[PDB]
Design a protein around this nucleic acid. Structure first.
Lengths: 103, 94, 62, 46, 77
RNA sequence: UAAGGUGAUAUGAACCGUUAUAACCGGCGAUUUCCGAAUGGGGAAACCCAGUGUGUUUCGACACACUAUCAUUAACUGAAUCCAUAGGUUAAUGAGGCGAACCGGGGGAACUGAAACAUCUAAGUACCCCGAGGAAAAGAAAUCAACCGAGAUUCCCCCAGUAGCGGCGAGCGAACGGGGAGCAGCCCAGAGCCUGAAUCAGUGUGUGUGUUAGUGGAAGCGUCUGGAAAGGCGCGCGAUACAGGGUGACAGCCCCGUACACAAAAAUGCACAUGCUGUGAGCUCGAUGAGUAGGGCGGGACACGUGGUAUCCUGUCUGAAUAUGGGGGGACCAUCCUCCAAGGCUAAAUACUCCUGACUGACCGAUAGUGAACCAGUACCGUGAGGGAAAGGCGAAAAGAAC
RNA sequence: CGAAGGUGUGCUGUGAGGCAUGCUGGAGGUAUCAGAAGUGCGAAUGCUGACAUAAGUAACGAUAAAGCGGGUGAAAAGCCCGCUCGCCGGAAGACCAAGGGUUCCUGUCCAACGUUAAUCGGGGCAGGGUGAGUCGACCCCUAAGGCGAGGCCGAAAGGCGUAGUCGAUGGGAAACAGGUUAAUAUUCCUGUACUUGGUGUUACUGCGAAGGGGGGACGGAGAAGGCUAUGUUGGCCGGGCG
RNA sequence: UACGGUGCUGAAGCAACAAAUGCCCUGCUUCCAGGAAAAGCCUCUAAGCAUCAGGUAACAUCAAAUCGUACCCCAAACCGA
């Protein structure tokens, strides 16, 4: 019963990257997801002789709150909410708006 | 007669150090980390079975754990048993 | 692996257990040196051993 | 100057150690009290 | 412990009151006595630390009965 | 129950897993070193040393079980001493230790007050000890009452700061009676008839209903400011859900929830229903608790300090009647009334919270609130019992500052 | 489009106070009229924290004592090496017990700790290091004493104590010399030893204890005599001829 | 020669005198204040067993586990903050 999952395309409801879109890269136990290309930070990576790291200003993807994103329904062209229901003895997610199953 | 299972459990590791190396080279004596409960005879048995090598004699000693400090918090390392096992003349160990 | 190991005799089990123990020992030996670059193996082996033990107990007086 | 504390381990143990405490009712009571308090070192015993 | 075996009389506390009513704690011990009692049924003497009241009771009832009672109570004699 | 996981400071490494034996959560199991009642003996707790037996051995040794004490019962054995008894060896069953408060019993202070102090008070308090239970204790009138009657115990409000007690000081302080909470009565002292008749406990089964994981769970967009919108301004929609918490500022409609509706393979509490084991109901005839009641001497308890002092308890010495009898009705006597001691059992209303869950607060918000928001009964102090701190906050996000 | 709090300013009320507003601050505040109080601090040799003063003052812990050259280093009175000097030598040397518990050795670092500096350290961090049949403990035996089945005694708790069982500071089998590590050695290695247990043997043939006896098994002082440790001198051997 | 040391090599290695508070000495002499215990050790048998075990005899083999062992120890490491 987790409404957003690893390989879902999501749209951002709030923040600096609000309105933008991207595939969820991975979801953390803390209640945050990391989405591809969305919330970007220019970390100053400190060099280390071991592990073959040169060290520089690396622009990487910081986490974002799951609440701040929403599963995008391709049909409506909009962000939607997700509900849960049992189809053929198996739980599945569905878009609240339009009532269609997520596949 | 020591049980096979027991024997396997006895021997913890080889001990690498300058002294150990010297022992290996000159006196034909291997330096092992063994179970703290492992008696000499048991250790010997383990050596014979598990390394396939005749044992002359085993000397053991208990190494006491060092007290350390990780930041502000104090904490002691574990005690462990070292065994010098002297192999018979001509016994080459892999 | 327990469902697979349940369909065995006592003698069969014992031998398997012994083998597992041996493997574990080997791993330990390797681990201490710089040979073992697959640490999870040790974890697995112990677990397997435990399972075997459990099975044995189940068989003999349970 | 010979100061009051002149340590001796055996003496300490016999005096104050766990077994001594156990031996008597009052000792037991003391131990219980300590336990209640939450003492880490219940007795002088190392 | 100063306890009549027949009756169960223990010591009890109380006061010495003086003429000026100065209470001070005291005891009242029972009038105990170790006495060999002839038991006609078993043909042997049974020693009992007993009060004079205990003795009286025994006389009244019969030693045997007393013994039985004691046994019932779980008391050695 | 799942698409994410391999607890935390704490990353990384090596890995597992994705529609179902990854992980996570719950039931029932398995494992469960040593010390500790500690129990094979010992001991400076976490160590030292056995004995016996059953199996194995590559014959060097292994393994694993048992071996405390007391009580009780049984078996065998067995002194002085003939029989016996004491004692002895086995066997079975139970106990032991720990734990907040509450509860019953055994012991039991002093400071203090009396403007000193001794009776008195503090107080049967603090404390020590023994024992028990989820509650305990008490309990089925030898009770009150007043010539009318009530009808076991316990607890609450009155009665009443009354009547009394009291160096008649300081202080102590009822009962009768009334209003309530809750209410339940039974058995043995013993034998006859009839024979399994109510009730209770253990124990299976069945039903209901909890508990121990869970499942679903409504409805919002645009625009302005801004680092960010949940704010402003617009126009909507849900509501048996506007409890609460989070989300980059204040969100019913973003998330978790909430109302509401559902859920248990397995374990288990409580109700009734039912089987089995033990237990005996109803009827007639009786019987009706003796070193006891009373008494003397000494103490204690009763609001009641020996007083004119009834009543209860008993350390001590005595000692009835026994229902045509006996107890009580606050010295004592007479009359009347009322009850039946010297054997037991008994739910409820009452007391408490170490602990679990839920919810609440004109309670605290880091010198407060627990001693302790933080790895605190820690550091540190003390031979020891024991004492005992300080110390919270970057940011929305480490983007924790490459060069 | 900036809350509380902080800090200025201006105005205002008889006063406790109030209002407004600049800066700082970055999220809360709260009129009115009622309600409740952990409701107001300069004092209590008050309590807690912070920071002054004396003051860059006294002191830097035995009056055994230093000097120079070289080294390393960012830097050397203090560290390493060297040569002088001085101090202890029945100790200020060496080895243990007790007690401590890694302080040992090596590398590395100098914030703090070291009464100064510090490259050094008993400081920080990492790694290494403690080898036993014969040393000690454990073990067998007991002393003072402790615990103590039954037991005797005691309101309870518990006290004393028999059988027993614990308890060294005492009694009880056995190892020496040399060599070696950065750091262990009667423990490692080299040589040469010893002990008391089993087990098996062949040879013999009275063994057997919870009991009997011996032994173990013991004071102070004094006196010698015999010895060795050890030292001195000579000889010998190697080196020297200032 | 990593200036720490490592490897090889190696003469004489006697005598006299002096000499402990150490050893013989747990002795001897002496004094009164009259000087642990128990085991190990040796020995004696009892119940027992009886031509078996057990004992001593050498010889062979196996055995000796466990824990301590660094370092300070009249001190900068213990008791004195």
């Amino acid at each position: 019963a987790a409404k957003i999952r690893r390989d879902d395309e999501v749209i951002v409801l709030t923040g600096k990257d609000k309105g933008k879109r991207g595939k969820v890269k991975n979801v953390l136990s803390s209640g945050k997801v990391i989405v591809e290309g969305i919330n970007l930070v220019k970390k100053h990576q400190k060099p280390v002789p071991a592990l073959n790291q040169p060290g520089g200003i690396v622009e990487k993807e910081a986490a974002i709150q799951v609440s701040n994103v929403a599963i995008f329904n391709a049909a409506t062209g909009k962000a939607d909410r997700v509900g849960f229901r049992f189809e053929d003895g198996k739980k599945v997610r569905f878009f609240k708006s339009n009532s269609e199953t997520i596949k | 007669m020591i049980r096979e299972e027991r024997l396997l459990k006895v021997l913890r590791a080889p001990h690498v150090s300058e002294k150990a190396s010297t022992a290996m080279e000159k006196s034909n004596t291997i330096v092992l980390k063994v179970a703290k409960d492992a008696t000499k005879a048991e250790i010997k048995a383990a050596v014979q079975k598990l390394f396939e090598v005749e044992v002359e004699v085993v000397n053991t000693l208990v190494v006491k754990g060092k007290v350390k400090r990780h930041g502000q918090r104090i904490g002691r390392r574990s005690d462990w048993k070292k065994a010098y096992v002297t192999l018979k003349e001509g016994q080459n160990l892999d | 692996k327990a469902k697979e190991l349940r369909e065995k005799s006592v003698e069969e089990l014992n031998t398997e257990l012994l083998n597992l123990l041996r493997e574990q020992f080997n791993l330990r030996m390797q681990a201490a040196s710089g040979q073992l670059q697959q640490s999870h193996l040790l974890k697995q082996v112990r677990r397997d051993v435990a399972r075997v033990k459990t099975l044995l107990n189940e068989k003999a007086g349970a | 100057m010979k100061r009051t504390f002149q340590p001796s381990v055996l003496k300490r143990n016999r005096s104050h150690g766990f077994r001594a405490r156990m031996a008597t009712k009052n000792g037991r009571q003391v131990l219980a009290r300590r336990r209640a308090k939450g003492r880490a070192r219940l007795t002088v015993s190392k | 412990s100063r306890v009549c075996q027949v009756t169960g009389k223990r010591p009890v506390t109380g006061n010495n009151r003086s003429h000026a009513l100065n209470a001070t704690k005291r005891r009242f011990l029972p009038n105990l006595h170790s006495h060999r009692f002839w038991v006609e049924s078993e043909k042997r003497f049974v020693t009992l630390r007993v009060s004079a009241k205990g003795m009286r009771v025994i006389d009244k009832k019969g030693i045997d009965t007393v013994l039985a009672e004691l046994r019932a109570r779980g008391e050695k004699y």
